[PDB]
Amino acid sequence: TGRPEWIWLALGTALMGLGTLYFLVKGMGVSDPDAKKFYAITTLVPAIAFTMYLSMLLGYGLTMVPFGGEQNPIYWARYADWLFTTPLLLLDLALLVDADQGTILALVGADGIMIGTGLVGALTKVYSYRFVWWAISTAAMLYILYVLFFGFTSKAESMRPEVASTFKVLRNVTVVLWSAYPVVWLIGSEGAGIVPLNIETLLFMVLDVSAKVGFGLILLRSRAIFGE
Amino acid sequence: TGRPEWIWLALGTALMGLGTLYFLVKGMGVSDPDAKKFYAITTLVPAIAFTMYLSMLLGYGLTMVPFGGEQNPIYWARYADWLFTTPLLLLDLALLVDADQGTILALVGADGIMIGTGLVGALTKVYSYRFVWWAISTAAMLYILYVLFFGFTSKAESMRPEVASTFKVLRNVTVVLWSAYPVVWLIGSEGAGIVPLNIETLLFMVLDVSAKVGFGLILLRSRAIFGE
Amino acid sequence: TGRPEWIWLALGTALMGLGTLYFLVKGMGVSDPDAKKFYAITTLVPAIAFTMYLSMLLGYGLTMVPFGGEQNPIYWARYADWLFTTPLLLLDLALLVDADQGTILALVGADGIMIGTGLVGALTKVYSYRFVWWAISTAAMLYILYVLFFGFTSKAESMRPEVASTFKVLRNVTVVLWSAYPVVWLIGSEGAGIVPLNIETLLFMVLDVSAKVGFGLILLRSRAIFGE
Ligand SMILES: *C/C=C(C)/C=C/C=C(C)/C=C/C1=C(C)CCCC1(C)C
Ligand SMILES: *C/C=C(C)/C=C/C=C(C)/C=C/C1=C(C)CCCC1(C)C
Ligand SMILES: *C/C=C(C)/C=C/C=C(C)/C=C/C1=C(C)CCCC1(C)C
C-alpha cells in the first residue's frame, strides 16, 4: 500500500514535472500556428500527469477496494490522468496526419470507453467481474490501434514525407507502450495480483514517462510539426 | 432493488451491444468524410449505453439514497450514460442541418444542465427538493426542444430536401421519446414512487433502445448523411 | 457551516438566475452567427453557476473535510461550477481576439489544472498539503494571465479597434477579479481559516456575480461581438 512504492511515485512526479517545464521553455520559441498546437497539446500531457502523480505520492489519489476477500489499495488517480492524457496523445497523432473529424471523434470516444471501463474494473467489488471490464477496455484499445494502422497509417503517406516517417515512429511507440498497460493491470494489484503493487507502480511509471515525455521529445524535435 | 429488474437490464445490455456491432460493421463500408462523422457519432452512442447498462446489470451503477424516510435504490449509471449520449444525439441532428457553432454550444450546454440537474435530483436527500431539480432539468429540456423546432427546423429546409425530411423525422422521434423521460422519472422510484423500480427500469430500457438504436437505424439508413 | 452564509447563497442564486434570464431574453434579438456564439457562451455561464449556487443553498454541494484537527465544511459545488464556467469565460475572450486553436487549448488545459488542483486542495486531509495544491493552482492561474497579456493583448490590436478596446476592458476585469479568488481561498475556511465561512461565502458571491454577470453585461452590450 501507500509506502514501499513511494519512490516510483516521487520519481514519476519529478520526471513529469521536469518534462513539462522543458516543453514549456522549448515552446517559448514558437510562432508557427500549427507548431503551437503540437506544443500546447504535448506540454499539457505531462502537466496533467504531474498533478496526478503528486496526488498519488501524497496519498490523495489512493483508495481501498474490497474484493477477492481483501481490502485492496487502488490508485484511482491514474484513470483521472489517462482520461485526459490519452485522448490528447491521440490528438497529436491525428493532427500530424490531418485526420478528419469523424475519425478523431471515433478515437476520442473509443479512448473514453477504454479508460472509463478500466476505472469501473479497478473499483469493482466482485473479483471475476473485474476481468469482464478489463476485456471490454482491451477491446476498445484494439479498436484504437486498428484505426491507427488501417485508418491512419494509410493517410500519413498521402501526406508529406517527414509527416509520414514521424507518424510511423510515434505510431510504433504508441502501439508498443499502450499494449503493455493491460498486461500490467492484469498481473498487478488491480487484476490477478501476481505482481506486488510496488512493482506494479514501477512498471506504470516507466510506461507513463516514456509514453508522455519520451513521446513528446520525439514529436517536438521533428520538423513534421511545422507547416513546411 | 437489484433483482426483479435484472431482465430489463440484461435485455438492454444485449440490445445496445448488438446495435453497436451492427453500426460498426455497417460503417466499415464508408469512405465519405461526412458520412463518417455520422457513423462515428451514432455508433459511439450505443457503445456507451452498452457499458452503463452492463454496470447496472452487474450492480456497479446502483446506489442507495435516503429520502422520504427510506433507503431508495438509485441507478446513477444512467446519468453518466446520458451525460455523453444525449449531446452526441443532438450533434447528429445539428450536423444534419449544418447548424452554426453558436447553436451547437447552446444545445450541448443546455443538455449538460439537464442531465447534471437530473443527477442532483436523483441523489438529493430531501424529498421535496428532488422535484425542484426535476423542474429545472425539465426547463432545460424544453429549451432544447424549442431550439430544435424554432432554431433548427427552419434551417433544415433552407438546405437539401432529403436533409429536411430526414431531420424532420428524427426531430419528431426525439421530441416524442425525450419528453417521456421526465414523466417516467416523476412517477418512478426517483420521484413520486407511484411506479415500482421494476417497471421504471423497463420503461427507460424501451425508451433508451428506441432513442439510440432506433434513432441510429433511421439516420444511418438515409442518404441525407452523404455529401450529395 | 450550512446556516449563517445562507443569505449570500440565496442572493447568489437569485442574481445568477436573473442574469441568465436577462441574457436569454436579450439574445432572442440575435441573427448574426458570431454574435450568437458570444450570447450562447455568455448565457451558459450564469446558468451553470445558478444551478451550483442553488445546490449549495439547499445543502447538496456541501461536504465535511477533516484536517488541521477539525471537521471543516467545504462547498465542493463551487469547483464543479468553475470547471465549466472559467473555460467558457476564457473562450469568450479568445473568440473576441480570434485566437488560434493552439492557444485556446493551452488556456482550457491550464484552466482545467487550476480548478482540478484547487479541488484536490479543498478536499485534502493533510493541512500543510492543502497549500501545495494552492500553489500549483496559482501557478496555473498566472500562466493564464500571462497568455492573456503576452499572447492575446498583442493580437486584439492587430484586429479591429472596437475588438481591441473591449478585449482590453474585459481582460482587465478578468485579471483583477480572478486574482482575488486565490487570496480568498487562502484566508478562508479552505486555507488558513483567518476569515469565517460566512464572510468567505460573501466574498466569492460578489466575485462570482461580477466575473459572470458583470462580465457578461460589458461584453453583450458592445459592438465588438458583431461581424462589423
Ligand atoms: C499517459 C498514459 C498513457 C499513454 C496510458 C495508456 C493506458 C492504457 C492504454 C490503458 C489500458 C487499459 C486496458 C486496455 C484494459 C485494463 C485497464 C487499462 C485502463 C489499464
Ligand atoms: C440515450 C438516452 C437519451 C436520449 C436520454 C434522454 C433523457 C432525457 C431527455 C432526460 C430528462 C430528464 C428530465 C427532463 C428531468 C428529470 C430527470 C431526467 C434526467 C430523467
Ligand atoms: C465564475 C467563476 C470564476 C471566474 C472563477 C474563478 C476562479 C479562480 C481564478 C480560482 C482560483 C484558485 C486558485 C488560483 C488557487 C486556489 C484555489 C482556487 C480554485 C480558488
PDB file of C-alpha atoms in Angstrom, chain A residues 100-103 105-106 109-110 113 117 119-120 123-124 126 129 132-133 136 143 146, chain B residues 24 28 33 36-37 40-41 44 47-48 50-52 54-56 58-60 88 91:
ATOM      1  CA  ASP A 100     -10.903  14.020 -40.488  1.00  0.00           C
ATOM      2  CA  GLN A 101     -13.173  14.997 -37.601  1.00  0.00           C
ATOM      3  CA  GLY A 102     -15.097  11.739 -37.940  1.00  0.00           C
ATOM      4  CA  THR A 103     -12.083   9.573 -37.151  1.00  0.00           C
ATOM      5  CA  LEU A 105     -14.325  11.599 -32.620  1.00  0.00           C
ATOM      6  CA  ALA A 106     -14.182   7.814 -33.021  1.00  0.00           C
ATOM      7  CA  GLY A 109     -14.861   8.100 -27.949  1.00  0.00           C
ATOM      8  CA  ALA A 110     -13.133   4.721 -28.008  1.00  0.00           C
ATOM      9  CA  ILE A 113     -14.650   3.932 -23.128  1.00  0.00           C
ATOM     10  CA  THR A 117     -14.317   0.775 -18.270  1.00  0.00           C
ATOM     11  CA  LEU A 119     -11.826   2.530 -13.940  1.00  0.00           C
ATOM     12  CA  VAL A 120     -15.059   0.595 -13.375  1.00  0.00           C
ATOM     13  CA  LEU A 123     -13.292  -0.281  -8.421  1.00  0.00           C
ATOM     14  CA  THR A 124     -15.441  -3.386  -8.920  1.00  0.00           C
ATOM     15  CA  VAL A 126     -16.724  -8.761  -7.435  1.00  0.00           C
ATOM     16  CA  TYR A 129     -16.370  -9.070 -12.842  1.00  0.00           C
ATOM     17  CA  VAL A 132     -15.068  -8.550 -17.741  1.00  0.00           C
ATOM     18  CA  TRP A 133     -14.360  -4.802 -17.605  1.00  0.00           C
ATOM     19  CA  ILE A 136     -14.141  -4.570 -22.764  1.00  0.00           C
ATOM     20  CA  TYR A 143     -10.060  -0.644 -31.943  1.00  0.00           C
ATOM     21  CA  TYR A 146      -6.683  -0.717 -35.572  1.00  0.00           C
TER      22      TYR A 146
ATOM     23  CA  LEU B  24     -19.699  -0.850 -36.557  1.00  0.00           C
ATOM     24  CA  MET B  28     -16.936  -0.396 -42.426  1.00  0.00           C
ATOM     25  CA  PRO B  33     -15.909  12.165 -44.858  1.00  0.00           C
ATOM     26  CA  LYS B  36     -18.045   9.020 -41.446  1.00  0.00           C
ATOM     27  CA  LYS B  37     -18.882  11.682 -38.849  1.00  0.00           C
ATOM     28  CA  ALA B  40     -18.709   7.669 -35.620  1.00  0.00           C
ATOM     29  CA  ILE B  41     -21.187   9.714 -33.569  1.00  0.00           C
ATOM     30  CA  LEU B  44     -20.493   5.652 -30.006  1.00  0.00           C
ATOM     31  CA  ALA B  47     -21.398   1.658 -27.213  1.00  0.00           C
ATOM     32  CA  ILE B  48     -21.507   3.972 -24.180  1.00  0.00           C
ATOM     33  CA  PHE B  50     -23.882  -0.712 -23.502  1.00  0.00           C
ATOM     34  CA  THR B  51     -21.199  -0.167 -20.863  1.00  0.00           C
ATOM     35  CA  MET B  52     -23.537   1.666 -18.485  1.00  0.00           C
ATOM     36  CA  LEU B  54     -23.795  -3.584 -18.057  1.00  0.00           C
ATOM     37  CA  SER B  55     -22.607  -1.652 -14.994  1.00  0.00           C
ATOM     38  CA  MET B  56     -26.206  -1.530 -13.752  1.00  0.00           C
ATOM     39  CA  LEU B  58     -23.652  -6.169 -12.521  1.00  0.00           C
ATOM     40  CA  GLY B  59     -24.659  -3.840  -9.700  1.00  0.00           C
ATOM     41  CA  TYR B  60     -21.873  -1.275 -10.037  1.00  0.00           C
ATOM     42  CA  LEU B  88     -23.955  13.187 -29.203  1.00  0.00           C
ATOM     43  CA  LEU B  91     -24.755  16.608 -32.524  1.00  0.00           C
TER      44      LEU B  91
END
